[PDB]
Design a protein around this ligand. Structure first.
Ligand SMILES: COc1ccncc1NC(=O)[C@@H](O)c1cccc(Br)c1
Ligand SMILES: COc1ccncc1NC(=O)[C@@H](O)c1cccc(Br)c1
Lengths: 304, 304
């Protein structure tokens, strides 16, 4: 028992982290096989970030200008190319620590672990979720760019995020491993405000099932609701509309606990309307939305 | 910017996890050099846990009865001994992945990362704190025993916890790496209720400084207090008494923000007396106490 914001073990990703330097800018890179992936803003100076022309900036850069260091050893750069907002540095050596891996573009609401890095060195790991407005509420300082988000399915690492920037609102934006930004963000130091950060309803319900599984049951009530009635409440509280796909994905949790999805929705409805009244659920005084139904099952069953 | 419950990168610990089986019981072991450390209750059957005589149970066990598997390869056991509540299995091979390490017995209030394991395989990593009542609020299922807690200072892993049991209250108890339980708990399936779980005041103050550093300042007020006045409030709210050692340890955070420790105490006093009024601090609706002043500085400065 017990429920924690748990991240995947980071070892497989740690063995991929390298330091990439170009001119006077140093950030993190991801070394998989004979390719190093890093944010293209590594070629920029502070003056360039105002409105950079990455194609024109990359013309003045040769393979020898990209310094790639893995631990204390220097990798030899034999090719460089830009794919969207990432640079792919072909090195002469395949990473001997390359795990089985995939590049996946996640959907908003999905979760992933982040290995925060500085100068190619890991500092920590934490669990995140892609917000419905395509930002992530991370913990990153200057030099953390190139740090990646990922999920692990037994031995396969699915890289889904690469950190690129911090918005003036303190929230984070980045790309998938093909260099495509999540959301409308551009890799430019400009006015970029995030949209409405709605609550991931399916995740809150999954976390409510996790609470019941771990003994916290005070919020269970004698009521039920319908998808349309629940969604009227969810709209009022800036919660994502619940769909039959969401109900279907909560099936195993509903089966495990014996609490119908719509009954759990009615508990959530009353919690939205009446608040927690000074009470807590799984050590939290607010409704947690960064655990997917998959995460709850995984943690409550011990998937390694 | 941003503040997260961040764990240490787990790679160095993952390379130490092995599976230990004795009879029909399988749990995790920690392989460092040529020794495997695991909870001594591995020699018990379900019937034995009611009141086990570990010395008498260990007499019927020989080196060949302890099956130690690292990945898919079997380690040869050449010695076995009991140190307090841990078993030390001498193997014929030093772990090639042994990092620089220490065994440390932490104080209540200190934090550490846990690598939850099952059958010698890591499932996840999360940040924990030793509660003042010597329990930890973890996330562990049957088979997680032998999973360890640790801290990392650059390249050195300081192992501080080994998971042994779950109390009927759903909280967790375990030992340091010398086999000594934190708190009064015994490795026996008996009535063991935890003491009062007080709030780690110095950590809440450190987290309040983290909030100011990251932009959340609404809770700052025009007041100050004294250590004795603050402690009258802390006693009423089951908070640990604040000492001059605690004030001293919060010195760097006070210096960074320019907010005197006693002024921050006065903000905490008003938050205890008036609550959050439906507001949040660093995405939490309650006062977070599982970040030490060291953790806040580390995260806010990017120590790798
Ligand atoms: C203090 O800087 C950070 C803190 C956290 N995460 C990331 C950063 N870095 C930046 O945001 C910055 O280098 C930048 C500016 C404009 C566009 C891009 Br692309 C990148
Ligand atoms: C479901 O079991 C768990 C869940 C989480 N963490 C640990 C366990 N295991 C136990 O508590 C159990 O093997 C036991 C019983 C009595 C004394 C000892 Br020592 C160990």
């Amino acid at each position: 028992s017990g429920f924690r914001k748990m991240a995947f073990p980071s070892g497989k990703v740690e063995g991929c982290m390298v330091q990439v330097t170009c001119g006077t800018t140093t950030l993190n890179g991801l070394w998989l096989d004979d390719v190093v992936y890093c944010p293209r803003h590594v070629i920029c100076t502070s003056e360039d970030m105002l409105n950079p022309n990455y194609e024109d900036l990359l013309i003045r850069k040769s393979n020898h200008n990209f310094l790639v260091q893995a631990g204390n050893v220097q990798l030899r750069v034999i090719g460089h190319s830009m794919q969207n907002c990432v640079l792919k540095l072909k090195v002469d050596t395949a990473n001997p620590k390359t795990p089985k891996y995939k590049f996946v573009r996640i959907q908003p609401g999905q979760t992933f672990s982040v290995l925060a890095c500085y100068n190619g060195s890991p500092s920590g790991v934490y669990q995140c979720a892609m917000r419905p407005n395509f930002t992530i509420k991370g913990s990153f300082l200057n030099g953390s760019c190139g740090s990646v988000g990922f999920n692990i399915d037994y031995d396969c690492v699915s890289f889904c995020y690469m950190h690129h920037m911090e918005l003036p609102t303190g929230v984070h934006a980045g790309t998938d491993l093909e260099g495509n930004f999540y959301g409308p963000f551009v890799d430019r130091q400009t006015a970029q405000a995030a949209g409405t950060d709605t609550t991931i309803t399916v995740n809150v319900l999954a976390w409510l099932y996790a609470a019941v599984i771990n003994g916290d049951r005070w919020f269970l009530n004698r009521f039920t609701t319908t998808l349309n009635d629940f969604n009227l409440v969810a709209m009022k509280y800036n919660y994502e509309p619940l769909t039959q796909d969401h109900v279907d994905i909560l099936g195993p949790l509903s089966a495990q606990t014996g609490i119908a999805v719509l009954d759990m929705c009615a508990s959530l409805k009353e919690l939205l309307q009446n608040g927690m009244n000074g009470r807590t659920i799984l050590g939290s005084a607010l409704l947690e939305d960064e655990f997917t139904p998959f995460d709850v099952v995984r943690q409550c069953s011990g998937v390694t």
